[PDB]
């Protein structure tokens, strides 16, 4: 029959779908991991970079601090 | 024949809905290595910023080091 041909063959095409499906799932799935890991990865480099941003700013103010305090004493040094 | 034109639209129905499968998939991986190398591309870029920002706050901590180091010295000089 015809019927023969069509259904031999429906085995075989319901079983490419069904694979179909489940790569989909897979795929889905893993695509939001990447996502969600990169772009945690991401905000955390942006986080040290602020971080090390106010570190120099630190350092900076630390030694026109220094500068400040040292030529003070010497300041004071030179009018005794 | 008739019975032809039936397993003829049935199995057009069986294969379309396969082809939107994959379909799907192809779409889901085109647009996640896309975003995903887009995201690595801007780590690439913060790593190497966070490299010289690290340079930068060493070299001032070694400079506030040596004002430190100098100003304790004259100190230490007027205390006895």
Redesign the interface.
Known sequence: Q??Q??QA??AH?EE??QL??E??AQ??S??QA??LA??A??RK??M??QS??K??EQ??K??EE??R??DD??SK?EKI
């Open positions: 015809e019927g041909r069509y063959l429906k095409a490419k779908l179909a499906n790569e989909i795929v889905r893993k695509a990447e996502a990169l772009q990865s991401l480099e942006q040290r970079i090390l941003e570190t120099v350092k900076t630390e030694n220094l500068t305090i040292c004493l010497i040094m």
